[PDB]
């Protein structure tokens with residue numbers, strides 16, 4: 124029965140109300156591999172790049188298995204969700220009419236690997252505990268650099284693009300890296316201001332690769348924080364999961380006298396308040412600029428869901 128209904132759900136992979144949780148349940152935890160394999164096929168990439176499907180499945184599996192399923196939030200299902208959202212944005216007319224198969228290929232791989240091997244604790248925690256990653260990357264986008272170099276290790280190991288020129292492989296690594304690093308939420312002000320200027324100037328030229336890759340970076344930043352732009356039933360689950368993971372980092376900081384990070388203290392913070400401030404200060408500003416770039420039904424739908432989800436969280440207060 125379950126393999127049947129999964130196939131059926133994928134017919135609706137371009138829907139904003141896709142249900143990634145049911146999809147992962149139906150596939151016995153195989154959502155990222157199964158979703159992304161399908162999108163590679165849907166976007167024609169297996170033919171366009173003469174990909175061996177056996178190596179494709181192996182690469183996708185090494186990615187999926189390199190997420191920590193025991194993280195409440197940062198696991199392969201969040202990756203699969205971000206990949207499905209990215210696919211919806213690639214379908215928006217300004218992207219659909221300018222992106223190349225190569226852009227589509229990098230965007231999906233970057234979405235799929237953007238949180239690879241995430242340890243379930245944030246950058247200030249890794250820095251203050253002297254984790255080896257923080258030294259390796261000199262305290263700068265420590266997580267994102269880790270996800271990226273981990274992704275480059277899987278690309279090399281899989282041999283999936285071994286038949287393409289070395290220079291193409293290197294460029295793939297570099298452009299994926301610029302996409303993943305854009306997901307460092309602590310640098311949102313820099314990406315959002317740059318984006319907002321171009322949008323004020325009206326100077327973006329989507330047949331220019333540099334401009335188009337800045338837009339793709341904005342698209343991936345959207346995909347990564349679009350949980351509140353989903354339906355209430357989806358958004359509620361993501362908010363519980365994200366909060367569980369934050370509160371767990373707080374319990375460790377409390378137990379070991381590490382200093383409790385903002386948002387991680389279960390005794391002074393609530394799920395509702397955490398969501399409301401996140402929506403006001405990070406989600407709405409990004410999605411309002413995004414809706415100026417791509418002024419479509421999808422962008423309105425996304426922003427209506429934020430307004431609605433925000434009223435729900437206020438409702439659940441006093």
Ligand SMILES: CCn1c(NC(C)C)nc2c(-c3cccnc3)csc2c1=O
Pocket residue numbers: 308347348349350351361362365386397398401405
């Ligand atoms: C969409 C999942 N998500 C993420 N994703 C970040 C981790 C990319 N961040 C936050 C924050 C937050 C607020 C302030 C500063 N840093 C994080 C509050 S709620 C929330 C959330 O639901």
Ligand SMILES: [Mg+2]
Pocket residue numbers: 237238266306
């Ligand atoms: Mg991340």
Ligand SMILES: [Zn+2]
Pocket residue numbers: 201205237238306347
């Ligand atoms: Zn993420």
